[PDB]
Coordinates of C-alpha atoms (C1' of nucleotides) and ligand atoms in Angstrom, one line a residue:
Chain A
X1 CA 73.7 157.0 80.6
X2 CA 75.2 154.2 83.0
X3 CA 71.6 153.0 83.1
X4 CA 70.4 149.5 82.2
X5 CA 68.8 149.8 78.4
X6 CA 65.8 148.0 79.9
X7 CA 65.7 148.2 84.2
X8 CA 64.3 145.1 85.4
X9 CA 63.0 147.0 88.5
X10 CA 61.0 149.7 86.9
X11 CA 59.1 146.4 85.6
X12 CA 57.3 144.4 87.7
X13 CA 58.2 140.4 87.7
X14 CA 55.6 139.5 85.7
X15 CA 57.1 142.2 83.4
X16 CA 60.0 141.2 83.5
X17 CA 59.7 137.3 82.9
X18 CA 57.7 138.6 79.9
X19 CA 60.3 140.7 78.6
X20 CA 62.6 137.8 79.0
X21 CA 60.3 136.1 76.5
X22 CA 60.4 138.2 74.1
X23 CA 64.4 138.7 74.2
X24 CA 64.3 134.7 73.9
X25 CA 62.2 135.1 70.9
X26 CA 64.6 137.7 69.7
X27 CA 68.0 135.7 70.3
X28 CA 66.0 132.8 68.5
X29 CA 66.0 135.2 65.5
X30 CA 69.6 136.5 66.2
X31 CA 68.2 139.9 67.7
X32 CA 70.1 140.8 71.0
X33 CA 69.5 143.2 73.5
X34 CA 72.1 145.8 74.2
X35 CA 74.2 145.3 77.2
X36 CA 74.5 148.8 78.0
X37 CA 73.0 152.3 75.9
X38 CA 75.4 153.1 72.9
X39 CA 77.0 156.3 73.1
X40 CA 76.5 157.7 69.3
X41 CA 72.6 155.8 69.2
X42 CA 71.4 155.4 72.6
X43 CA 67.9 154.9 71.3
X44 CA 68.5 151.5 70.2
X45 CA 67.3 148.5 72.6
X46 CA 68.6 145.6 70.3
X47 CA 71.2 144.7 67.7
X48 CA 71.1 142.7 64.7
X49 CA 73.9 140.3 64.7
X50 CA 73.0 138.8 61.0
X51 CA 73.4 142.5 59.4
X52 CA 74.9 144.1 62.6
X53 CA 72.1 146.8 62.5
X54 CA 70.8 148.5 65.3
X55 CA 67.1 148.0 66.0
X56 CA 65.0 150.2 68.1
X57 CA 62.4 147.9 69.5
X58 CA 60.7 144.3 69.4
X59 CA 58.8 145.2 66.7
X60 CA 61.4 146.8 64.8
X61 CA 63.1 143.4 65.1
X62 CA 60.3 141.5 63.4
X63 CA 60.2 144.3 60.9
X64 CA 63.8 143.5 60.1
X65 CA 63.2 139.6 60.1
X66 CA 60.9 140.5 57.8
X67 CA 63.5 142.2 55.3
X68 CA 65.1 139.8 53.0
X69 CA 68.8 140.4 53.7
X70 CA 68.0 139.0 56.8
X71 CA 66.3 135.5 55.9
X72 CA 69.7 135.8 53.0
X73 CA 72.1 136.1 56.3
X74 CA 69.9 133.5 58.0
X75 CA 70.6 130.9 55.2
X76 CA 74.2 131.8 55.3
X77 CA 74.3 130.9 58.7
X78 CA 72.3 127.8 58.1
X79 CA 74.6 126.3 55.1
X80 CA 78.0 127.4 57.5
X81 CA 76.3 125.2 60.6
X82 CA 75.8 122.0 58.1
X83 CA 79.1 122.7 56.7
X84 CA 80.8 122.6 59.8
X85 CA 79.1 119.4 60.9
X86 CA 80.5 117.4 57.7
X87 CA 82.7 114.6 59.0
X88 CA 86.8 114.8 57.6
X89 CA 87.0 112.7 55.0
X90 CA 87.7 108.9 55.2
X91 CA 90.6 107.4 53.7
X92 CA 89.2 106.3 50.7
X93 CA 88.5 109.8 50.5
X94 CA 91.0 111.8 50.6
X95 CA 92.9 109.2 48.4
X96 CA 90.1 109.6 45.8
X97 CA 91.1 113.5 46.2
X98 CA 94.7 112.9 45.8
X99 CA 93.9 111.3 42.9
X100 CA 91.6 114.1 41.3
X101 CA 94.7 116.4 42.2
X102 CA 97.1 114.3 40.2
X103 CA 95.6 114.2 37.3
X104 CA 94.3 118.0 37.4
X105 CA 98.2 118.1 37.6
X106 CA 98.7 116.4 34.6
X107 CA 95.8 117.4 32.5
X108 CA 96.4 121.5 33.1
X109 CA 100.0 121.7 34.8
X110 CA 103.7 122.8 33.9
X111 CA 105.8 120.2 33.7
X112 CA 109.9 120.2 33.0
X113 CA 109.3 119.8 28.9
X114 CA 107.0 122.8 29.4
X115 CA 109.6 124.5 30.7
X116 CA 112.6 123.7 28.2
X117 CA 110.4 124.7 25.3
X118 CA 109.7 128.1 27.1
X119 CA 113.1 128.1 27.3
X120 CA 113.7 127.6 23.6
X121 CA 111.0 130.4 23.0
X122 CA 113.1 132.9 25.1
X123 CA 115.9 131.6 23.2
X124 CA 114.7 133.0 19.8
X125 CA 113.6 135.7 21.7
X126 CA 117.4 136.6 22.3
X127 CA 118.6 135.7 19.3
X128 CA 116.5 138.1 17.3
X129 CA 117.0 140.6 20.0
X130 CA 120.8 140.6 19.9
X131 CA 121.7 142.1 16.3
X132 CA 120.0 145.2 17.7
X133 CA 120.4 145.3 21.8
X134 CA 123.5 143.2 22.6
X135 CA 123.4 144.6 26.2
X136 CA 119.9 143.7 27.3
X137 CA 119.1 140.4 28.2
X138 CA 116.0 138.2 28.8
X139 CA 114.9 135.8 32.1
X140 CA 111.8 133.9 32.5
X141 CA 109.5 135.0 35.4
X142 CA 105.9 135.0 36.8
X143 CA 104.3 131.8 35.8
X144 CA 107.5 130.3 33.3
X145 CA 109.9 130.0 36.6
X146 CA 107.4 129.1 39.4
X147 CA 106.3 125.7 37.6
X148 CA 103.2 126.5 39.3
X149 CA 100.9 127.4 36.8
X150 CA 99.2 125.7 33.8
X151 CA 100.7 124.7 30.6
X152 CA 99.0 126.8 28.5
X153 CA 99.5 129.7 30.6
X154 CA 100.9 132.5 28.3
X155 CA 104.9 132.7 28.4
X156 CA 106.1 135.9 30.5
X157 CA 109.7 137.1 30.1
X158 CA 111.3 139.8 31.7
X159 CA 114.5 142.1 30.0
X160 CA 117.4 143.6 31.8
X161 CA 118.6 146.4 30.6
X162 CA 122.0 148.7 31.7
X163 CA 120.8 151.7 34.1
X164 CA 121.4 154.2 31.5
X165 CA 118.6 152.7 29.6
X166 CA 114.8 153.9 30.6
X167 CA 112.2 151.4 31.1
X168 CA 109.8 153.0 28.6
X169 CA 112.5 153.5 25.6
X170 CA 113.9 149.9 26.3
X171 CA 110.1 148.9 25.9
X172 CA 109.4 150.7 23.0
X173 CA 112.8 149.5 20.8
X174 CA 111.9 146.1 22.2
X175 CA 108.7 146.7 20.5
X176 CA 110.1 147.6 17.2
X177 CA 112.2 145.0 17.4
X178 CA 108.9 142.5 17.6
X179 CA 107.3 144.7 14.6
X180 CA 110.3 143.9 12.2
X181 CA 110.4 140.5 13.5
X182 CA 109.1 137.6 11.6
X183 CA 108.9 135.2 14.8
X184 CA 106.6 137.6 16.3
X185 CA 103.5 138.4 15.1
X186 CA 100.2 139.9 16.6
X187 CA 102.3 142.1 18.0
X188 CA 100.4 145.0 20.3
X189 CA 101.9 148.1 22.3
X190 CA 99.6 147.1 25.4
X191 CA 104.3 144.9 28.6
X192 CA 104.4 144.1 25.1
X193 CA 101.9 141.2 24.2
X194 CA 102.6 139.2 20.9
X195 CA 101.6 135.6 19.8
X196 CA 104.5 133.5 18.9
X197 CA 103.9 132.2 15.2
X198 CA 105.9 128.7 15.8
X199 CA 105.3 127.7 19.6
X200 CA 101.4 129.0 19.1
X201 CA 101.7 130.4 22.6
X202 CA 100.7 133.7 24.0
X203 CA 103.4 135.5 24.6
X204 CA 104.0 138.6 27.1
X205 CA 107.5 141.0 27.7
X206 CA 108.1 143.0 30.7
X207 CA 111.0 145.4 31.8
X208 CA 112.0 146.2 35.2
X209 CA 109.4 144.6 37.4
X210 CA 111.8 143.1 39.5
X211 CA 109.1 142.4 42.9
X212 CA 107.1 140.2 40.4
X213 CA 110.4 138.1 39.5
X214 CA 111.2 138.0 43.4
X215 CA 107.9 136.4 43.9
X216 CA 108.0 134.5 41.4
X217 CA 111.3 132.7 42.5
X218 CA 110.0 132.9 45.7
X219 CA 107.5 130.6 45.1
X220 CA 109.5 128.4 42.7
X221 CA 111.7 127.8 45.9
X222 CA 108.9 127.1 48.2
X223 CA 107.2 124.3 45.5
X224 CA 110.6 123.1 45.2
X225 CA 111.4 122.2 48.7
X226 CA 107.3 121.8 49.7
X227 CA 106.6 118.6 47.2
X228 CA 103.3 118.8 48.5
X229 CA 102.5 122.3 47.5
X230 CA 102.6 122.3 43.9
X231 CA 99.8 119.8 43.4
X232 CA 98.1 121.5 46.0
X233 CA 98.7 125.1 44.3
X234 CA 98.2 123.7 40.7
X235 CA 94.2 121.9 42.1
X236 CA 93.8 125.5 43.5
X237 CA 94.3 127.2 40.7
X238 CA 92.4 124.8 38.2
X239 CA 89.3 125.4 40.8
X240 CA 90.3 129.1 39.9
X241 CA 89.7 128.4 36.3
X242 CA 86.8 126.0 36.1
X243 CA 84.8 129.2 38.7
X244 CA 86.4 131.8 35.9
X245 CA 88.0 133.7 38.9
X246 CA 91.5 133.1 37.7
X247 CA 90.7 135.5 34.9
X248 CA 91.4 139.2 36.1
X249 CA 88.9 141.0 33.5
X250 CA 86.3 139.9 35.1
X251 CA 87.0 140.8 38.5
X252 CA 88.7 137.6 39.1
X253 CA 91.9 137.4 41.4
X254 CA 95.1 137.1 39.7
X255 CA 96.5 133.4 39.5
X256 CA 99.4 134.2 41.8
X257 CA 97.3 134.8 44.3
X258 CA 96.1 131.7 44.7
X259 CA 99.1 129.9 45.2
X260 CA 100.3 132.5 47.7
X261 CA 96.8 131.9 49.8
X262 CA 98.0 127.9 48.8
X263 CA 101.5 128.4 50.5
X264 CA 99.7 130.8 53.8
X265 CA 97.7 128.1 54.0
X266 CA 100.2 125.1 54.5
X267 CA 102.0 127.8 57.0
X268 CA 99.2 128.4 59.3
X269 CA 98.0 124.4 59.7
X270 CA 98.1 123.3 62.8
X271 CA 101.2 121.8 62.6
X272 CA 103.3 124.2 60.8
X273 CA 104.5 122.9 56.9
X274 CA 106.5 125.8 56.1
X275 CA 108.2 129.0 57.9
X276 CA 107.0 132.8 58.0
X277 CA 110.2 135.1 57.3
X278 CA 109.5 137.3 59.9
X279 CA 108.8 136.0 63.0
X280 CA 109.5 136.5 67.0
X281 CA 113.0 135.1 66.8
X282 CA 113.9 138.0 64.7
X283 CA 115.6 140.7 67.3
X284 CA 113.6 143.6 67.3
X285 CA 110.7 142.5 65.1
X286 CA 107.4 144.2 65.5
X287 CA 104.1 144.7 63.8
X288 CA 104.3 148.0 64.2
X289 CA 108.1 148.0 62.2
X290 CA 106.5 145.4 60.3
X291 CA 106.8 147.7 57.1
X292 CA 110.4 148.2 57.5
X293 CA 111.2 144.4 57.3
X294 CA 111.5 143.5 53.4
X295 CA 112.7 140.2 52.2
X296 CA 115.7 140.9 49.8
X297 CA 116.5 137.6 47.8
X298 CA 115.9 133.8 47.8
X299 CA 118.5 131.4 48.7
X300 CA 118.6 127.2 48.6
X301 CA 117.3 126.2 51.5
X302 CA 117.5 130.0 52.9
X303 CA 116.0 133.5 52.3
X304 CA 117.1 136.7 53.2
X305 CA 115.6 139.4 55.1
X306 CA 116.5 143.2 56.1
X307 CA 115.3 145.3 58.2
X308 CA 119.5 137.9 58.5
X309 CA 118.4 135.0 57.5
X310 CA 115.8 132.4 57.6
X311 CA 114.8 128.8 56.4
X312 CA 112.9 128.4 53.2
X313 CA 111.4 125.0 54.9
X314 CA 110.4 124.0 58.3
X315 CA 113.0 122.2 60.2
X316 CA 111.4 119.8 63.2
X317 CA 112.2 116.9 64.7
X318 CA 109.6 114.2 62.8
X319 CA 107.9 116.9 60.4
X320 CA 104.1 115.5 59.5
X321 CA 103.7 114.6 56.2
X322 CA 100.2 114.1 55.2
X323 CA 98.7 113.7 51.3
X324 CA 98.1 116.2 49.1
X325 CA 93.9 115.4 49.4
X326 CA 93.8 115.9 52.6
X327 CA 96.0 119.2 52.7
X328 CA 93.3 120.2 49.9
X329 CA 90.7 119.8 52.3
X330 CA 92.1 121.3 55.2
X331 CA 92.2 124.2 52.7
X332 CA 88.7 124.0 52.1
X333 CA 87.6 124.3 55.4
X334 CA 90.6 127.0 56.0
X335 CA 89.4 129.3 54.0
X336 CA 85.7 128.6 53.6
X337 CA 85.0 128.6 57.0
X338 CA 88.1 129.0 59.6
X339 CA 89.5 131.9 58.0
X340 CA 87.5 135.1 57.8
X341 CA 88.8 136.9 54.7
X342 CA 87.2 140.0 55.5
X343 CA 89.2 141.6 58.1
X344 CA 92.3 139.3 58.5
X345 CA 95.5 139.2 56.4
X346 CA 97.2 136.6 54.1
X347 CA 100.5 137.7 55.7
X348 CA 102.8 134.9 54.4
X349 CA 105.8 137.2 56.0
X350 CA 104.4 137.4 59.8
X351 CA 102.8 134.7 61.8
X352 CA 100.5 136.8 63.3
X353 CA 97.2 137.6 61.2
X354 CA 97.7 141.0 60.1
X355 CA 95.0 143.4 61.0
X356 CA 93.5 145.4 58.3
X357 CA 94.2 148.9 60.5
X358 CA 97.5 147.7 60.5
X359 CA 97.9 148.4 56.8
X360 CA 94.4 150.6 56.5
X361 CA 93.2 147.8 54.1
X362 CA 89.3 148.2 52.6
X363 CA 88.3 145.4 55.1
X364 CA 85.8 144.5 52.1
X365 CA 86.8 141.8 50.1
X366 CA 89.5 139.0 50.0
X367 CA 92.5 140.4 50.8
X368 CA 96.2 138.9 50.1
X369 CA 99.8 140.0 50.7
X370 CA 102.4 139.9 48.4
X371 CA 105.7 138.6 50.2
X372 CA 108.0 141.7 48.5
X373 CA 105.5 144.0 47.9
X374 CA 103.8 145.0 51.4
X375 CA 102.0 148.0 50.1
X376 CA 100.4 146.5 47.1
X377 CA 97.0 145.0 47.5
X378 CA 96.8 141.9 44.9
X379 CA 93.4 141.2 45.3
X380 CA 92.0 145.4 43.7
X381 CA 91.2 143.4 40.7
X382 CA 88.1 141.8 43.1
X383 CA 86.4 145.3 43.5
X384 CA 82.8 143.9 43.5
X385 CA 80.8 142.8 46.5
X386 CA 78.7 140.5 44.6
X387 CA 82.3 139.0 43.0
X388 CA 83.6 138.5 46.5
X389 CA 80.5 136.6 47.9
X390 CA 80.3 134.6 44.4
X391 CA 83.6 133.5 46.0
X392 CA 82.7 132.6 49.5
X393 CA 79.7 130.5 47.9
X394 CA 82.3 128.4 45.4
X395 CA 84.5 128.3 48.1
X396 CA 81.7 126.9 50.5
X397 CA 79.9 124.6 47.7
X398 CA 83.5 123.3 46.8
X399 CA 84.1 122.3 50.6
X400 CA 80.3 120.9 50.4
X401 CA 80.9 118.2 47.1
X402 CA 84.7 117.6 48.6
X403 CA 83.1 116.9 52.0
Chain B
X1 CA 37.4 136.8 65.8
X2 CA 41.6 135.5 67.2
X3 CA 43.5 136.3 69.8
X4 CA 46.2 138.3 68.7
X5 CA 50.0 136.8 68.8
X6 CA 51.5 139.5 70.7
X7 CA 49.0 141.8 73.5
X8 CA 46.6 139.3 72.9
X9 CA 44.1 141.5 71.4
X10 CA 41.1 140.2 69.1
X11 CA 40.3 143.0 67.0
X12 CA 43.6 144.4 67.1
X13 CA 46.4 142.4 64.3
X14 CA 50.0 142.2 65.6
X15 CA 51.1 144.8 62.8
X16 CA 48.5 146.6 64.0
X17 CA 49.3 146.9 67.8
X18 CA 50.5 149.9 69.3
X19 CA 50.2 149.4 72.8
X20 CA 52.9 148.4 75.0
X21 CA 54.5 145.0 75.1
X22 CA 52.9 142.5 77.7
X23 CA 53.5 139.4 78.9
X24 CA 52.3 136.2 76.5
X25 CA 49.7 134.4 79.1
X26 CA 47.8 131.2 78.0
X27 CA 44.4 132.1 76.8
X28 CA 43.2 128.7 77.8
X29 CA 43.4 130.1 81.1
X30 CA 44.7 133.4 81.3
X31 CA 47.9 131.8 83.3
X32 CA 50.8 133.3 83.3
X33 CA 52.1 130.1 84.9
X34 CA 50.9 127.4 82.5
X35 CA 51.0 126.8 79.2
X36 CA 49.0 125.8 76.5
X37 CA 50.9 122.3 77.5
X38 CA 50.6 122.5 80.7
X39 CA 46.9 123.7 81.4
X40 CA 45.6 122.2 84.5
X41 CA 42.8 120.6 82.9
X42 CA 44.8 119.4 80.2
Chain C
rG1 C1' 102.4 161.2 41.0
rG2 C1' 98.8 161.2 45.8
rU3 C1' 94.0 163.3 48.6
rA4 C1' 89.2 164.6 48.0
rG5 C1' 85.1 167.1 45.2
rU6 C1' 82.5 166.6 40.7
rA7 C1' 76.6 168.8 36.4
rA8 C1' 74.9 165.8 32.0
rU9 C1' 74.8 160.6 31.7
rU10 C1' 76.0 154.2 32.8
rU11 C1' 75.8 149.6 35.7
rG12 C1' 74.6 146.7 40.4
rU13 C1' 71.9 146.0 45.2
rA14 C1' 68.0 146.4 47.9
rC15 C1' 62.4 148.9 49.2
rA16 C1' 61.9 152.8 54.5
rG17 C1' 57.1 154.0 51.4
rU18 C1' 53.1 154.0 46.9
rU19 C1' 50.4 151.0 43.7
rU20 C1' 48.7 146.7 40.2
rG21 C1' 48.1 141.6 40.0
rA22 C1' 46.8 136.3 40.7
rG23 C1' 46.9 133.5 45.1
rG24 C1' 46.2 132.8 50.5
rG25 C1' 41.4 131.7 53.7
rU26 C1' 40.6 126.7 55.3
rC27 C1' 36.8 125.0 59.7
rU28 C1' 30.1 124.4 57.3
rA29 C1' 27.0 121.8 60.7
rU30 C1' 26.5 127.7 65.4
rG31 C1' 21.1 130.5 63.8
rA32 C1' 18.5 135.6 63.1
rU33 C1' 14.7 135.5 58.6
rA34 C1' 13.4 138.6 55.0
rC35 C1' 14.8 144.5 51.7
rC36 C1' 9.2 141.2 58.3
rA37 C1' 13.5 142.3 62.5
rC38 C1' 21.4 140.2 60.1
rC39 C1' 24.4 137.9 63.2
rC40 C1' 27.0 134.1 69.7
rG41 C1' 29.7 128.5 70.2
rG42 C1' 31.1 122.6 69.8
rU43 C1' 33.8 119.8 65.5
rA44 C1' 38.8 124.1 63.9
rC45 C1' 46.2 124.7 65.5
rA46 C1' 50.1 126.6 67.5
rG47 C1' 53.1 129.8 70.7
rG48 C1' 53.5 130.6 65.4
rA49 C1' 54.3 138.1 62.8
rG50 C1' 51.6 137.3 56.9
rA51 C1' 53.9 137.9 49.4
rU52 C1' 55.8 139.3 43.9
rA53 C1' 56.1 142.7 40.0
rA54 C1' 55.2 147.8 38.1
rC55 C1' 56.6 152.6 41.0
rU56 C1' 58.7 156.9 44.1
rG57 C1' 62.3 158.8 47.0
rU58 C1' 67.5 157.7 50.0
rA59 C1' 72.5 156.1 51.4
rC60 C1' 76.4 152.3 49.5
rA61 C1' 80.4 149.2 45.4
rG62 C1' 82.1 149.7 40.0
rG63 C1' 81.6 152.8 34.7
rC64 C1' 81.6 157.7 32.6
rC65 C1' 87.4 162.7 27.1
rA66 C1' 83.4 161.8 35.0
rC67 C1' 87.3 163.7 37.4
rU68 C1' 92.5 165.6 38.9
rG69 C1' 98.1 166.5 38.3
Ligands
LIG501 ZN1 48.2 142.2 69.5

RNA sequence: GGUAGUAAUUUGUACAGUUUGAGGGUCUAUGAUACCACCCGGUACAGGAGAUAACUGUACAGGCCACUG
């Protein structure tokens, strides 16, 4: 078995100059001998690297050619070679793109006025809530706080309620409170989901949920102190849109997701933008007690972990600052091309790429972390193979018309 | 009525061939050493 | 609540194989005819491996009071 998978000496020269041919031929084609005889499948004289698929002999490689996933893998290869060729962009053009991002910003963003009529919804939100639950209260979360999502993204507000209250009776009174309710209307069991009859705006409640309101002031924290990232996010996430992968009922990612692949993004650059929270500093800290680290709550200019503290934003002497069209780019080609989504990942807490046997992850699809909820997988709503490659091509025809 | 593209057999189509793989020689001729390009005529 | 299994049925991807179709050939001067005897090369390249739909089986992602507590 320690045996050469084709012996040069058991063939004569000629032989074997020919056989060098043919493997020449072969590598043309992306066919490549085995080094050595596989354990499991020792029959196999060649792999395929375009579908990773073993191939018995010459002619099975040209068979294979043949087969149409290849000449599709072939392409693939093709369009990522001219992609990676494609100069940076010139001044003029990553000003043109800083522009585009502006006014995306404006056209579909959430802007402070945004925000103090939200507030004004959650406002008669507690007011009819109070004649009937004094005790619970109401905070906005998910897109509302972050400032990071669209305008006419549907309002989400979140209730605390004392601990002697149950999360599914305080839903359902919060429900018949809606029902009797004149200011709500298309009211639905579903979170409750309601349409407001004044604002117009969709409107969703919540109890409990308290990793999605981390996050979410998580992220309003990082836009805060990054200005850079919430143009950047907000570009993302109208690409999102415009492609229809924003919308999770069709197998689409969830908006969050976006910015948090926005914000690993601006972490792993070359030069660093913002911090990880866990990271080799921390005393102790391993991938392997990765799980035990959590991050417990978000403070200005601060966060805190548990297993201490760390910076919300990088501190270095003479931090680059670079615009927002060319940090959109840089995504581009992060995640189009540098970053293989596959197997590595979006670990905003660790430096390090996270392995998929790490977590035992599918390995399948695009895959993203949430920063407070390490064994939820964000990106389940993407179950489809075809909807994950539907991705990699936008992703790679976006990079293509940006570059 | 062609030389085949891999054995170089006539009769026998490159689907069709079963034999062993052997060397790709230039028919123009029969050097293992030359070419079609570099024929020592040519 | 978690793991897997799961008849009858619902999507998606190919096609190892079958079969139907138009197309593809190019390349004639190089004739050997007739039901008297039918087949060789010079015009004519490169290192280049040759289909899409109807059809059969097989693993693989979702759906299914499927399925479980
Ligand atoms: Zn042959």
């Amino acid at each position: 078995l320690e045996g050469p998978v084709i012996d040069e000496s058991v063939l004569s020269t000629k032989e074997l100059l020919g056989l060098q041919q043919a493997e020449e031929r072969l590598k043309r084609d992306c066919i490549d001998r085995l080094k050595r005889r596989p354990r499991n499948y020792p029959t196999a004289k060649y792999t395929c690297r375009l579908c990773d698929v073993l191939i018995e002999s010459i002619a099975f490689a040209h068979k294979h050619i043949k087969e149409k996933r290849h000449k599709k893998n072939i392409k693939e290869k093709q369009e990522e070679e001219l992609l990676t060729t494609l100069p940076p962009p010139t001044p003029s053009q990553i000003n043109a793109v800083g522009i585009a991002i502006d006014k995306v910003v404006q056209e579909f963003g959430l802007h402070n006025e945004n925000l103090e009529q939200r507030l004004e919804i959650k406002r008669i939100m507690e007011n009819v809530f109070q004649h009937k639950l004094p005790d619970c209260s109401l905070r906005l979360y998910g897109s509302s706080c972050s400032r990071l999502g669209f305008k006419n993204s549907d309002v989400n507000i979140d209730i605390q309620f004392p601990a002697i209250m149950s999360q599914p009776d305080v839903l359902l009174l919060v429900q018949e409170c809606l029902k009797n309710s004149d200011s709500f209307i298309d009211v639905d069991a579903d979170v409750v989901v309601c349409r407001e009859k004044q604002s117009g705006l969709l409107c969703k409640v919540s109890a409990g949920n308290e990793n999605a309101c981390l996050t979410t002031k998580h992220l309003t924290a990082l836009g805060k102190l990054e200005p850079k990232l919430v143009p950047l996010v907000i570009a993302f996430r109208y690409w999102a849109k415009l492609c229809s992968i924003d919308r999770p009922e069709e197998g689409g990612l969830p908006p969050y997701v976006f910015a948090l692949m926005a914000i690993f993004f601006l972490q792993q650059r070359k030069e660093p933008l913002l911090p990880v929270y866990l990271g080799s500093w921390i005393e102790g800290f391993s991938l392997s007690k990765l799980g035990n680290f959590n991050l417990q709550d978000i403070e200005k200019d601060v966060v805190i972990w548990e297993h201490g503290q760390v910076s919300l934003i990088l501190d270095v002497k003479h931090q680059p600052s670079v615009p927002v069209g060319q940090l959109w780019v840089e995504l581009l080609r992060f995640y189009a091309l540098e970053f293989n989504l596959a197997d590595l990942v979006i670990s905003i807490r660790v430096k390090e790429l996270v392995s998929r046997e790490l977590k035992d992850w599918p390995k399948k699809r695009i895959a993203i972390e949430d920063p407070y909820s390490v064994k939820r997988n964000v990106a389940r709503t993407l179950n489809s193979q075809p909807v994950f490659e539907y991705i990699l091509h936008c992703l790679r025809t976006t990079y293509k018309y940006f570059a | 009525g062609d030389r085949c593209y891999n054995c170089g057999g006539l009769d026998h189509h490159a689907k069709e061939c079963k034999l062993p793989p052997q060397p790709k020689k230039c028919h123009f001729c029969q050097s293992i050493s030359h070419m079609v390009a570099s024929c020592p005529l040519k």
